[PDB]
Design a protein around this ligand. Structure first.
Ligand SMILES: CC(=O)N[C@@H]1[C@@H](O)[C@H](O)[C@@H](CO)O[C@H]1O
Ligand SMILES: CC(=O)N[C@@H]1[C@@H](O)[C@H](O)[C@@H](CO)O[C@H]1O
Ligand SMILES: CC(=O)N[C@@H]1[C@@H](O)[C@H](O)[C@@H](CO)O[C@H]1O
Ligand SMILES: CC(=O)N[C@@H]1[C@@H](O)[C@H](O)[C@@H](CO)O[C@H]1O
Ligand SMILES: CC(=O)N[C@@H]1[C@@H](O)[C@H](O)[C@@H](CO)O[C@H]1O
Ligand SMILES: *[C@@H]1O[C@H](CO)[C@@H](O)[C@H](O)[C@H]1NC(C)=O
Ligand SMILES: *[C@@H]1O[C@H](CO)[C@@H](O)[C@H](O)[C@H]1NC(C)=O
Ligand SMILES: *[C@@H]1O[C@H](CO)[C@@H](O)[C@H](O)[C@H]1NC(C)=O
Ligand SMILES: *[C@@H]1O[C@H](CO)[C@@H](O)[C@H](O)[C@H]1NC(C)=O
Ligand SMILES: *[C@@H]1O[C@H](CO)[C@@H](O)[C@H](O)[C@H]1NC(C)=O
Ligand SMILES: CCCCCCCC
Ligand SMILES: CCCCCCCC
Ligand SMILES: CCCCCCCC
Ligand SMILES: CCCCCCCC
Ligand SMILES: CCCCCCCC
Ligand SMILES: NCc1cc(=O)[nH]o1
Ligand SMILES: NCc1cc(=O)[nH]o1
Ligand SMILES: NCc1cc(=O)[nH]o1
Ligand SMILES: NCc1cc(=O)[nH]o1
Ligand SMILES: NCc1cc(=O)[nH]o1
Ligand SMILES: CCCCCC
Ligand SMILES: CCCCCC
Ligand SMILES: CCCCCC
Ligand SMILES: CCCCCC
Ligand SMILES: CCCCCC
Lengths: 330, 330, 330, 330, 330
């Protein structure tokens, strides 16, 4: 039917003349996974192209598009859009190459693909786990410049669609929108680009329950030593060192759960402040015991004031620190 | 034999006319693995197709189907069914492409494949480990719409078969059934879909033995401190902090075994309630010791009632909590 | 030399007539690895085929087989045997496709391959680590039924060979033998199958040394508390709780080493019985202390009998449990 | 247009004559990851080639370069540069082979590629985590020697470009520069090589906070035992052993975080010196207790001098060690 | 130039006659990694072949070898050497197939490849970590027997070269040499083989520092209990159980670092002997306390001799065990 053998398809339509417009339509299917260590995300989507080529015109009276088996792609001219800043990608081939080709009698062509793309996304972990991340996906032509191929969205803001089943266990996805920008390369010239933007928000309940509660509980447990009688040395001494050991074990367990190795985080600040409080509580009893021993030795030849002042100083200081910490990071 | 070279197979049979019916028969072989972190399952199955094409008719007197070496698939028209919402898939090729082709003299064609499909499945972990999960697999044509290709099960409910060796170590599989639905796409039209549904149930003995028994044992061990004489401070004090440390180690060990990071679970509720009970038991002795010291100091210038009331309050409260917890989640 | 271009190889020899016998010879090279979580094993083997085809006859006077470069496989008819219940497989291609083809002047053909096959194998872990496992590998034709292709071993029991270097670090391999069975499919008919069977036995020294010795040592250490004077409360109390903590740490460490998550095992029974013994030993001293305190309070207004009876009850009970456990599982 | 079918492209231009100059231009896109265990890095870059071939000349009046669909690469002569000391590499093929081809009327050809390369890099971990690492990437022709192909940078130092988004979470990248060297092979001759060099610096805050602070805190906690009265044996004895246990747990936790298994590191020196200090502190109290017991036994038939001297010796020794350690490694 | 189309290359040179000699030259580039669990190593090397074929002769006056683009390999006869006992292998294809072809006017042909080979190697872990391992790589023809193809090293011992950058972080590589052997197969005949041998030695400092030092330190710490006064029961009792717990934690940490699961090792012997010593030290104090209590009870109605004898017995026994252990394993 088509006069494929009568023309050479190694050259774009309108070779040597003005640029050929190409439209893009995208439908996002699902998001597979997000890796924070490698800073990338995986997305599966449908890609569509629109253009006109008079060399594919065939005589017909129905004036309706006809579907071909997709094996003609290797013989006709096809746009070569590629994903920028991508690490790995492939096209599904079960049970065959997922390629759709529709040609109208007047020469309008529709081309579709189903691809999986992995792209990088820089993340900021300063406000972890309260941080908010933004990522984007870029589409650009490889060989043809702006003077030979024009790339634009088919229907503007209506060219992007999202499946209702898109969801993530640890993140909340919202605010899908599209924008365009012009890029420049030193050795080749100017190219057009297409962007797909979205915003990710992290759930806070799990991190709070797993991290902040044990530290506060351990601090309150360490606060108990201020009320036991100072004469019970074999009871006062082991409590502080056991609290230190338990805090060390908690810190060791928390670190192995989530690897970041980037910079300081608010969770580390909280944990180290709690550790410093525990250390000061441990030193306080040693100071009290030394003073009591010196006083008894001097007397030889009532509750101590240090404990009474500590019982007021420590809780107020911890409350002030909590208020400052939850006001700085909101 | 077949007049392959005398016809063009780039167009479907009955091109430009009514839709061509296609039948589907599926036999499930085995299930490989199920991942809860990525929410997907792997399945190996046999796929079969039925259709009629007069272009493949050959003269014969036996009126019986004949088998070909499968190399004719690349030359004749073949349906292009694909699996929806799939992450990765492939066709086995050992020692060759597992493709079967049978053509009857009147033009009836049988086509078979052996594929492995990985598909996503959303899971709810609110009732873990008592939760029950349901998953499904979807089959749909890619290029041809409803007006060009009709997809239906060959024998209705009898078109699905399961191997007797299908089993899972951690899950129980039951209730295989099939259903059909019609789907719509904005930019292409309507398509038919086929569904394969099954239900998964989780075994409870392992989780119970590994999680609930140690917590109850630790709570009962912490309950021992209510009977030791209050004068044995170097014996009463270390017991509570050691119980707290042991509970913390148990919680740390349990968390690393199964990662979910989705939302609150009943196991977390049980563990944190046990931790709160241990913390209250620790604080009770400190309160008793402070009251006893104050009483002795006042007297200077019998079993305490707090222990007697605690010996009754704590076990009854824990029994009530256990009854409520096992009645809410059944 | 061969008249390949003068014949059509899309049809089997003797098309439309009786079945064509095919012989199979197998030589096992090595076993790569065995996974208990996924229940599969990896094997590398040589596969050979024997059949006769008069279309490949060439005139010769030496009456000896000649070797070809293997590129003729894509042009001539080749059997399409596939491995049943396999997960993944491939053919080595370094530095080229490992294919051997030998054709005798009278038309006898030899075909060889070198493949790696991963196949599933159900395992029973009830008697772990004393369990014994059996696995098998299946070979079957895909497209041709029994009425078109007959599959049998070339020399019966002598058709299987094993390399002398086959060994496993954790398993003992023995009793290689072959057997045949006939299989049926509802939608296609009957097919022949070939089986390769072997038996695996697990080494016991490592598991014994790593698991059973620490539990017995901890039980014997907990038994020490029965001889210390009851008046040393700050020495008797911490010992039991420290033993409980050590046993909990040991149980946590053992579980992370080997994941099964299938059902109860004998190791779990042993560990939980040891834990129950430790718990009872802990409760015994609390009961003794309460009774002694009550007796002293009554007296105010010699070794206790409980310890004397426990010193006899506990070791005898543990010995009886050990005898029962090692008699049930042999 | 091009007279591809009129010439044989199995031979290089100017076959049998002088060498054909080839220019190279490289633009680095991003760095994916760096592995210290396997000592390799991953890089994604654009590769460009420049050469002249009169066989591709076509008549034109615009005197401007024209772009082809890239399918002509398989038919024309193309340089075969390969990356030396590479482990794995591939060319992206989504949605098609990322190949650009531009031919001017006079025969000048531009060829571009987009590849991902993994290359080895030896690292020195003696000064970890203060170490500084240097890596390089090598490009060399495979088949053609120096007498047949000349390789050089197109514009010298200006032939290398770097993207502004290149960054690493754990490393700082700086000082990109290029250099050339001549290599020799015994069995083939001489070849030219191209180098891309960069320097990596490691961030120190995370390692300091995670490693050095706990050790100093534990040493200072162990220093507390010098001030408690010597008569409190049940308080002095457990403190040292608990400090030893906590230090052992810290060392165990630190080792599992970062695997090197190469040689001694400064962190190990610091940790073992701290452990030795803790061990000496433990032994000091035992010596003091033995001397006090002997003195009391002799007397039967004031603060001890050992503690007074230790209170001065230990902090000064630790400060001296810290100064020496931070002066040796700067 | 070459008369490729005038000859059939499906048959080896000298078909039906004497064997055709083939030379092999190998240059090792680097070793990637060594896995002890799977018992295999990865190697990257250059492979070269030498043979003569009069069918490739071309008229020339320079009498010098000419280089071709490597695309002629698919059309001419090429040897099919394969690696025996290999698990996986591939040929690098960036930016193209790394194949070199040189043909002299008289018909001498040079063929080169760049491959990565993974091969198994049985290891003995009885003397770990003092063990020494030896591995080898095997090269053999697949289809052609000895009567059709002769395989030998081109220059004997000088046919093997090693890069100066070959190194391993955990192993020392030395003594590269080559040898040949003749192999036999029951169903095909005799074949020649080529071997590449090397020896690996393990570094001892890391294992010593990480394993043997903590055990000796813990034993010496447990030895402290022999000097404290027997009347300090709340100080003597916790020390032994805490030492046992610390030793158990150390053993748990060491095991998770290196998995072998093969047989008993010397490190396990050392650790279990240390554990037995600690257990005996724990039991000694219990025996002493029981004897002292019985003596006091008898008296009612000086240092004990057991401690005095233990202070001599234990260190001498440990020194004797150390001498025996370091003399048996040298
Ligand atoms: C020449 C002609 O009739 N062209 C028709 C056009 O009028 C119609 O709008 C379109 C959509 O159906 O189909 C075509
Ligand atoms: C024309 C003719 O004889 N057709 C036969 C049909 O009658 C029979 O039912 C079928 C099944 O064997 O085979 C064919
Ligand atoms: C016709 C003829 O001579 N055939 C021979 C046969 O006799 C011999 O047994 C066989 C094995 O060498 O080779 C062939
Ligand atoms: C023959 C001729 O006109 N050649 C032109 C040259 O003069 C010009 O410098 C170049 C760059 O545009 O294009 C070409
Ligand atoms: C016929 C002739 O001249 N052959 C020459 C030979 O003499 C020389 O040894 C060799 C190496 O250059 O090259 C060729
Ligand atoms: C389309 O969306 C873009 C980005 O979301 C926005 O800037 C623009 O105003 C929108 N256009 C209309 C017509 O609403
Ligand atoms: C077939 O099965 C479906 C779903 O299981 C059910 O709704 C339907 O009633 C069944 N049909 C018959 C005829 O039993
Ligand atoms: C061959 O082996 C099978 C299975 O091992 C056995 O049943 C059969 O008796 C053997 N045949 C002979 C002839 O020994
Ligand atoms: C170019 O850079 C190299 C290496 O960085 C340097 O040696 C050389 O001097 C530079 N050349 C010029 C002209 O600056
Ligand atoms: C070559 O090396 C082999 C093995 O290393 C050795 O046996 C042989 O003697 C050597 N030959 C010569 C001539 O040195
Ligand atoms: C159940 C979550 C508790 C979080 C407490 C946070 C205290 C700062
Ligand atoms: C052997 C399983 C014991 C489960 C106990 C559960 C108590 C709530
Ligand atoms: C060295 C192995 C000891 C195993 C002891 C088993 C006791 C039941
Ligand atoms: C917050 C980092 C503290 C580092 C202390 C280092 C002491 C040598
Ligand atoms: C720094 C290594 C110490 C090794 C001590 C070994 C004692 C047997
Ligand atoms: N992104 C387009 C392009 C062309 C090129 O040579 N490098 O990048
Ligand atoms: N699922 C069918 C289809 C066609 C298309 O363009 N997108 O999806
Ligand atoms: N195992 C043979 C076969 C054929 C088929 O259609 N399904 O299985
Ligand atoms: N690196 C070039 C080359 C050629 C060869 O045979 N070995 O290396
Ligand atoms: N290693 C050569 C060979 C040939 C065969 O059939 N099996 O092995
Ligand atoms: C940079 C914050 C460090 C806090 C140490 C207590
Ligand atoms: C949301 C449940 C929290 C329980 C804390 C004790
Ligand atoms: C089913 C066995 C449980 C044992 C608990 C002590
Ligand atoms: C080689 C340094 C060892 C240090 C041991 C304290
Ligand atoms: C086989 C050696 C065992 C050692 C147990 C102490």
């Amino acid at each position: 039917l088509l006069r494929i053998d009568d023309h050479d398809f190694s050259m774009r339509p309108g070779f040597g003349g003005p640029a050929i417009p190409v439209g893009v339509d995208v439908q996002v299917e699902s998001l597979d996974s997000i890796s924070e260590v490698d800073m990338d995300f995986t997305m599966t989507l449908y890609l569509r192209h629109y253009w006109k080529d008079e060399r594919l015109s065939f005589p017909s009276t129905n004036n309706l598009s006809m579907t071909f088996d997709g094996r003609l792609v290797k013989k006709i001219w096809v746009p070569d859009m590629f994903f920028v800043h991508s690490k790995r990608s492939f096209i599904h081939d079960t049970t065959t190459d997922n390629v759709m080709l529709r040609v109208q009698p007047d020469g309008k062509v529709l081309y579709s693909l189903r691809v999986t793309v992995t792209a990088m996304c820089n993340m900021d972990f300063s406000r972890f786990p309260l941080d908010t991340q933004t990522c984007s996906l870029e589409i650009e032509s490889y060989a043809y410049t702006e003077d030979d191929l024009m790339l634009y969205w088919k229907k503007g803001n209506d060219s992007l669609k999202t499946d209702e089943r898109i969801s993530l266990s640890q993140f909340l996805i919202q605010e899908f929108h599209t924008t365009t920008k012009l890029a420049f390369y030193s050795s080749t010239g100017w190219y057009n680009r297409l962007y797909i933007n979205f915003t990710l928000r992290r759930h806070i309940f799990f991190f709070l329950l797993q991290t902040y509660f044990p530290a506060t509980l351990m601090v309150m447990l360490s606060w108990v030593s201020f009320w036991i009688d100072r004469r019970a040395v074999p009871a006062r001494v082991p409590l502080g060192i056991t609290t230190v050991l338990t805090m060390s074990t908690i810190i060791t367990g928390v670190n192995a759960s989530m690897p970041r190795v980037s910079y300081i985080k608010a969770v580390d600040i909280y944990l180290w402040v709690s550790f410093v409080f525990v250390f000061l509580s441990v030193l306080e009893y040693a100071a009290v015991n030394y003073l009591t021993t010196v006083q008894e030795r001097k007397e030889q030849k009532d509750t101590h004031a240090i404990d009474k002042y500590s019982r007021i100083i420590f809780p107020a200081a911890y409350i002030l620190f909590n208020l400052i910490y939850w006001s700085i990071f909101s």
